[PDB]
Amino acid sequence: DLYSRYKKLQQELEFLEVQEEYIKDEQKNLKK
């Protein structure tokens, strides 16, 4: 069962990475 939670946290990390990249792009676009 702990495999499941570890993979879920890994997906959480990747999703946060996606959010950070998207926010950087939106920040540049919004500044322009």
Add this chain to the structure above:
Amino acid sequence: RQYYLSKIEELQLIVNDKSQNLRRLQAQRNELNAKVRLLREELQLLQEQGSYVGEVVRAMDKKKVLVKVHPEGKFVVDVDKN
């Protein structure tokens, strides 16, 4: 189990720290977007003209009121939704 527990603890640490980072970044975005929206609506309103200034002489029943304005003169006008 050692591998498993250690890596999930690590994941928790990085995920929470990046969640705080995301909080900061998202807040900055939510201020910038609000400001941009403000400016856009300001310009859209700026397109609207100056609507005159007048003084009413006598209300003459709902949907009709008399008002005098500079040298255009005295006009009867229907009131808006207010």
